[PDB]
């Protein structure tokens, strides 16, 4: 079904510098002659972008993997239609569902399904003497299709059946983002011919599609099309048939951009915010022409590098268990009080109990109770029926809260309660606990 | 990609809890949203109060944490007639332990063995090394404290993006050149609409220079750019020669 064909040749890496490209509309609204400043996940104007070259025309075969890292600014130029699509997947097997984006002449298919890929997946086309036509029946990229999740079919885009000879290279420049379960593919089709693949002329991108799919992909692959060629026996050459390609990949860093909208709604140009101090002045005045003078742009501060904390090494524990392991509790009319001081005591152990019916706290949220520390810790205890446990709280009334034990309105602490009918009840009733019912 | 008649939620009137957040409960059907997220699960009745913003405990801390900026409804009702099994139902599970509290709306599915104690057990259950999942065990005899409660959480999304979900409303013609607020498949138009041009790239929907001059009537069948302007508000003054001179 599938044949494994690996290679030993590896190409060296290279890098270059982006100049101006990478500006897209950050919203679906229309603004004319406006200098709106938008904060978004853009890319810096002067950035380093990785440059890769595909199969070199004796022949060199390679297939690299590039990190995604919160979107990718992609640029490429091809004319032989060698690039058919991409496959995305952390493992690219039946363990997890895999994404396959394929563009062909008939249509474009985006399949999110579990596909069993090989070590070196590839796609091939051939020609039939009897059919007098070409077809693609070499589905060696995947072996089995199970656990189908998503299938999307769209009409082909950004492909023109134009036949010309000369330096008619066409530039394709996309931006990939994946946020909040939404995949956004911005693009700009601008045919520009120039010796260097990365031009200088400014351009503004537009949204193309939006896929409402949430998936995290770390490693991907870009496939290729192999055309079968009939050679004479004297040639004795076979095994690989493909073309050549190259592309640029850059990353996006979130920051603020002051963007100039043309009267037609397009973008004439834009200026970064943190590129240079002049750009900071240009952004802080929302203008492009700054007259001579001194402008206050922002503030600068020195950031701390480490945190310092110290406490005595004795760390003697205080009897938080004394007011919790106590066998007998005083009645509410004579509530017992226990002072806690000169100690260290965590409060996550109360969580480890998880046996409390009500752990409601006031003044200080107990998510990080142990973070701070206090002048004095007071432990009070009593026993009441679960009817009025709710009224032992700041600003509460009732006979229990008005005649026996009343919290202050500015109270700051936790209230802890549980059910213990096991330890303080007996057949015929337990009459040890008495509560005050009347008072002036 | 559909209209949502939320009035049927009140029509059933069989829901124990319906209290909503960040949007009017009764007149919910009168607006439109960028997207409608429907989350569904089943939990214990005594813990349904935990599915709410700013709530802490077991479920809201360890399985399904609702964000503070949540704008949507929360729904619950009894399920004994459909989810009670004699001898206890053990199909349902709820996570008991976590390394840390989940981020809002997160979805934790991993079944890695939890290390409750100080002795590492290299992902093998044993003493104080527990399987994080655990069954509810719905006894049909059990009272309202331990009943199986089905919960549906609707998470809306309000933005300026194309609203795919919308209320029923009605259908009638369109008028312009006279200031009037109305609706046309999700429009407000508090002002006078003119047959402007405002050449705009065929992907945008709204439009404003400072506050609002939106256009592009939201009808999928017909699109047209309609400027939005006020209808000549103005102060009024009075000239009087003097009450003791004339009238």
């Amino acid at each position, epitope marked *: 079904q599938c044949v494994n064909l690996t290679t030993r040749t590896q190409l060296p890496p290279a890098y270059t510098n982006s100049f101006t490209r990478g500006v897209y509309y950050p919203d679906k609204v229309f603004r004319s002659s406006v200098l709106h400043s938008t904060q978004d996940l853009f890319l810096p104007f002067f950035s380093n972008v990785t440059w890769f070259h595909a199969i070199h025309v004796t022949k060199r075969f390679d297939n690299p993997v590039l990190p995604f890292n919160d979107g990718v600014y992609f640029a490429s130029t091809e004319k032989s239609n060698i690039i058919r699509g991409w496959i995305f997947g952390t493992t690219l097997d039946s363990k997890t569902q895999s994404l396959l984006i394929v563009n062909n002449a008939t249509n474009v298919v985006i399949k999110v399904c579990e596909f069993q890929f090989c070590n070196d997946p590839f796609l091939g086309v051939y020609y039939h003497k009897n059919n007098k036509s070409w077809m693609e029946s070499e589905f060696r990229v995947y072996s089995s299709a199970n656990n189908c999740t998503f299938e999307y079919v769209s009409q082909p885009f950004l492909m023109d059946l134009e036949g010309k000879q000369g330096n008619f290279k066409n530039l394709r420049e996309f931006v990939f983002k994946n946020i909040d379960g939404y995949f956004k593919i911005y693009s700009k089709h601008t045919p520009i011919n120039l010796v260097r693949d990365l031009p200088q002329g400014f351009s503004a991108l537009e949204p193309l599609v939006d896929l409402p799919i949430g998936i995290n992909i770390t490693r991907f692959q870009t496939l290729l099309a192999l055309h079968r060629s009939y050679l004479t026996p004297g040639d004795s050459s076979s095994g690989w048939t493909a073309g050549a390609a190259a592309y640029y990949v850059g990353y996006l860093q979130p920051r603020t951009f002051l963007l100039k909208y043309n009267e037609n709604g397009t973008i004439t140009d834009a200026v970064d915010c943190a590129l240079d101090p002049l750009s900071e002045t240009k952004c802080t005045l929302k203008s492009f022409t700054v007259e001579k003078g001194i402008y206050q742009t922002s503030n600068f501060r020195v950031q701390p590098t480490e945190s310092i904390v110290r406490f005595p090494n004795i760390t003697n524990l205080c009897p938080f268990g004394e007011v919790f392991n106590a066998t007998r509790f005083a009645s509410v009319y004579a509530w017992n009080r226990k002072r806690i001081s000169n100690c260290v005591a965590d409060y996550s152990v109360l969580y480890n109990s998880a046996s409390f019916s009500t752990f409601k706290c006031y003044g200080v949220s107990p998510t990080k109770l142990n973070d701070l520390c206090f002048t004095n810790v007071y432990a009070d205890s009593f026993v009441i029926r679960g009817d009025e446990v709710r009224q032992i709280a700041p600003g509460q009334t009732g006979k229990i809260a008005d005649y026996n034990y009343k919290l202050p309105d500015d109270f700051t602490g936790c209230v802890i309660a549980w059910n213990s009918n096991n330890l303080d009840s007996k057949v015929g009733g337990n009459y040890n606990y008495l509560y005050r019912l009347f008072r002036k | 990609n559909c209209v949502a008649d939320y009035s049927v939620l009140y029509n059933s009137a069989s829901f124990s809890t319906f209290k909503c957040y960040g949007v009017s409960p009764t007149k919910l059907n009168d607006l439109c949203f960028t997207n409608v997220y429907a989350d569904s699960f089943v939990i214990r009745g005594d813990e349904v109060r935990q599915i709410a913003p700013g709530q802490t405990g077991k479920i809201a801390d360890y399985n399904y944490k609702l964000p503070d900026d949540f704008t949507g409804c929360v729904i619950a009702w009894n399920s004994n007639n459909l989810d009670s099994k004699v001898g206890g139902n053990y199909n349902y599970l709820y996570r008991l332990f976590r390394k840390s509290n989940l981020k809002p709306f997160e979805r934790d599915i991993s079944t890695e063995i939890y290390q409750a104690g100080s002795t590492p057990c290299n992902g093998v259950e044993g003493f104080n*090394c*527990y399987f994080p999942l655990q069954s509810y065990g719905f006894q049909p005899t059990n009272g309202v404290g331990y009943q199986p409660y089905r919960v549906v959480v609707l998470s809306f999304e309000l933005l300026h993006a194309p609203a795919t979900v919308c209320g029923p409303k009605k259908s009638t013609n369109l008028v312009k050149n006279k200031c009037v607020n109305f609706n046309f498949n999700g429009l407000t138009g508090t002002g006078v609409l003119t047959e402007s041009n405002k050449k705009f790239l065929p992907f945008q929907q709204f439009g404003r220079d400072i506050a609002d001059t939106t256009d592009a009537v939201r009808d999928p069948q017909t699109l047209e750019i309609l400027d939005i302007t006020p209808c000549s508000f103005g102060g009024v003054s009075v000239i009087t020669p003097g009450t003791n001179t004339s009238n």
Partner: nanobody
Amino acid sequence: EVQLVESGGGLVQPGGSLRLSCAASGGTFSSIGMGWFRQAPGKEREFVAAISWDGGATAYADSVKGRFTISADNSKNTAYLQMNSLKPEDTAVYYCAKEDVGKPFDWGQGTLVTVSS
């Protein structure tokens, strides 16, 4: 001295049943879970069963999967263990051990149980 009361240990025929109980009091009023271990003559200590004190989660060893039932009553503050299909190898001494938040597993004196016909 943390005292755990172990009851039910005694002689039992092969393929029988038993109900062992470990009762406790104290432990800073709050723990994380309770457990049962066993030690056979000529053999070291080994894990048998465990139940968390907060939830009903149960952990069983491979050699006792599906034939024991370990529960606990928080109100009674006592752990109960139900034994069925007593194999001859089960002859050992069983300990009830209480691990607490950052605390060892309270190791009682243990009780001897012998499987013989």
